[PDB]
Swiss-Prot record, chains A, B:
Annotated family: Belongs to the selenoprotein S family.
Function as written in the Swiss-Prot or TrEMBL entry: Involved in the degradation process of misfolded endoplasmic reticulum (ER) luminal proteins. Participates in the transfer of misfolded proteins from the ER to the cytosol, where they are destroyed by the proteasome in a ubiquitin-dependent manner. Probably acts by serving as a linker between DERL1, which mediates the retrotranslocation of misfolded proteins into the cytosol, and the ATPase complex VCP, which mediates the translocation and ubiquitination.
Residues shown, of full length: 52 to 122 of 189
Subunit structure comment from the entry: Interacts with DERL1 and (via VIM motif) with VCP, suggesting that it forms a membrane complex with DERL1 that serves as a receptor for VCP. Also interacts with DERL2, DERL3 and SELENOK. The SELENOK-SELENOS complex interacts with VCP. Interacts with CCDC47.
Post-translational modification: Truncated SELENOS proteins produced by failed UGA/Sec decoding are ubiquitinated by the CRL2(KLHDC2) and CRL2(KLHDC3) complexes, which recognizes the glycine (Gly) at the C-terminus of truncated SELENOS proteins. Truncated SELENOS proteins produced by failed UGA/Sec decoding are also ubiquitinated by the CRL5(KLHDC1) complex.
Chain intervals for the UniProt region annotation (VCP/p97-interacting motif (VIM)): 28-40
Disulphide linkage map: none
Protein known as: Selenoprotein S
Subcellular location: Endoplasmic reticulum membrane; Cytoplasm
Amino acid sequence: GSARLRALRQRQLDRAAAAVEPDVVVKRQEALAAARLKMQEELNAQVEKHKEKLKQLEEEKRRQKIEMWDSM
Amino acid sequence: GSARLRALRQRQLDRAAAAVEPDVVVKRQEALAAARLKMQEELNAQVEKHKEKLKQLEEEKRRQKIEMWDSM
Ligand SMILES: [Cl-]
Ligand SMILES: [Cl-]
Ligand SMILES: [Cl-]
Ligand SMILES: [Cl-]
């Protein structure tokens, strides 16, 4: 071994432990939570868009029937 | 006037009346009804597709929540 290698190991240990230090853990959670919020906003907007489309399609179905009876 | 013009008028009258002759009326109705059936089949398939999408989006919303609680 050597002094340089012993220093390298210690720095690797510092890096390995840093992944789960409290500042890192909270920042990484905040990043995950912000991504989840964005994705929930997008899912919600899609849900509303599909509901609106279903409303419109039902109205077109009703119109097709009325139109027929009107044309008689 | 003239014989050719009197014949032309009579043929125009035949054409004008032909639009509402019974064979024409039934064939034109069958064309309208076949178009309506096609459009109703397409509306119905769209309705089912949007319902399926809504089902999937609701499942993704639920998954996002479970995943969070699981990650704690
Ligand atoms: Cl470590
Ligand atoms: Cl849509
Ligand atoms: Cl006529
Ligand atoms: Cl869809």
